[PDB]
Symmetry: D2
Subunit: 150 residues, 4 copies
Amino acid sequence: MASQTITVGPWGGPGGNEWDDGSYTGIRIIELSYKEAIGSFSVIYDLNGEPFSGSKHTSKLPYTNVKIELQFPEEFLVSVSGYTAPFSSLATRTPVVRSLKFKTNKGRTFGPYGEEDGTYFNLPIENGLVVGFKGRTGDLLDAIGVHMAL
Amino acid sequence: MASQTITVGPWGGPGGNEWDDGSYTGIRIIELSYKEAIGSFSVIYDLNGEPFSGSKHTSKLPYTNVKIELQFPEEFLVSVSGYTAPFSSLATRTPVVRSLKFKTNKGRTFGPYGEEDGTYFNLPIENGLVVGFKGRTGDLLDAIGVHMAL
Amino acid sequence: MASQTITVGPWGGPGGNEWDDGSYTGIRIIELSYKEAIGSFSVIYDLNGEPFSGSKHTSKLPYTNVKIELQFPEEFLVSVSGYTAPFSSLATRTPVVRSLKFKTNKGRTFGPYGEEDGTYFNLPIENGLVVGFKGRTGDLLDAIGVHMAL
Amino acid sequence: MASQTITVGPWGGPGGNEWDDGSYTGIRIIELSYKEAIGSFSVIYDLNGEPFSGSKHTSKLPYTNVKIELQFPEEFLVSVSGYTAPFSSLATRTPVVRSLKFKTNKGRTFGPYGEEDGTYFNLPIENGLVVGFKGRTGDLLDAIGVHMAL
Ligand SMILES: OC[C@H]1O[C@H](O)[C@H](O)[C@@H](O)[C@@H]1O
Ligand SMILES: OC[C@H]1O[C@H](O)[C@H](O)[C@@H](O)[C@@H]1O
Ligand SMILES: OC[C@H]1O[C@H](O)[C@H](O)[C@@H](O)[C@@H]1O
Ligand SMILES: OC[C@H]1O[C@H](O)[C@H](O)[C@@H](O)[C@@H]1O
């Protein structure tokens, strides 16, 4: 009964534990870690002109960390894409987010991070904004979904 | 540029200094002060299930303080109304918000607070939710407007 | 169920029979009739770049006909306002729409139509667009409300 | 412009003429034709409780026609997916939509129609409704996108 946003996804599997950051007014910074798949994933959002830190979604796997810094508000995501598949190590197992790639309205590209292994997904946005992320994390990013608004 | 909401108003006059709390997921508490007019006006928002304290828009005048606590999220505002006019010592030239009055979907009325003098304003909400307030404040609540989503 | 819009109002009384044109993409023309109150009310909407005629909410009373033609798409409404009150030769007793006035982003004012008797209502719009009207009609316009979108 | 919706995609290629049906209040019927790719694509939308026929984007090619009738408003689309790739049979090997598939909230699957050749696409919708389709059609369905609303 509170305020809601359009939500697309998830892409990824049933594994790991639900999270949902909720909705805000834009993206400032995305922080992720990666190796053979995506590990950690966390976001500094914009909330009405000031940063808001989302709950951290940390894998303790010793992965490479990266800070994607957007030129907010003039720069914003126009595409979120990536690959989903199992990672061999979880014995018998369930699809995770192997790769993420981001494009901005400025023509910047971030990534691809991880390994482009498995089934492709792609959210090209023609009109609208990413205003929040949701997903599932175990030892790593099992699934990812986006909230959108105008 | 960042996420936007439907915004109605303002009601009141061009005095004091502008402010805009922006948009959130809902309303938990409204804090105001009053006597002949509205003084202080501040809001505790809901942002994704937790409280978020908006910026204070305080008056130093010795007015009566009231704290409006809604049972969010099942309770919500379905009307905002009030009167605007000069208050003929500190706002001789421009109208301020003299009164405010809120109704909820559970049939609680809060107010009228202040004095019911001058030009009526009335926003019944048939569908949608008040997500944020903006206004103008000097020693008094010169102006107010509302951001809406759903 | 089906897609929805933010809707505000009603302004007016409970007589007459309810009607709801629904939501569209914008406004091309408003047709009304007036004398001491508003009679007829009907709209030619924009629907994805072509006109779409709303049901006619006509009155048989001997009133003056007005057509408000907007320069769509560049011209849109930014204020809907008016007055409500009972009307003397009313076989019943409850409030009707005595007057309506509209302003646009091009600084055109259409009206007041009717008489400015009774209780004032005013919807300034700072962000978003009139995408439909609802109301109540008998021999006169008993009430009026507005759907809004981005 | 006039009123807007969140728009995602397009998926497919830059061939054949632009079309955009715009936005409505939901979907009733989708009509398409298929064989090696999608040819024809047209939609009967809901508009405020009544059917509204979108513009026809017919293919002349001698393809198999199908009619997808959703039990509107209780049933609606929760996934749009498909495949894009060039089609040997046009000399222009600009990518067209080779197949589509539609799932609903009741567990119905319509498709796949056409052949599942080239790059997958997939829009699963967690919250929100498809209100509109946009695309590109020459000989065949070159590309497709969706408008979403709440
Ligand atoms: O997140 C990747 C995997 O990590 C952990 O091993 C979880 O137990 C498993 O459910 C999840 O799929
Ligand atoms: O807020 C009431 C009034 O008082 C302030 O002290 C300001 O100087 C004036 O601009 C404002 O209209
Ligand atoms: O519209 C004015 C009035 O007109 C009609 O006569 C109706 O019977 C009444 O219900 C309504 O209030
Ligand atoms: O519709 C599929 C193809 O057929 C048409 O004839 C167009 O000329 C071409 O641009 C398009 O890619």
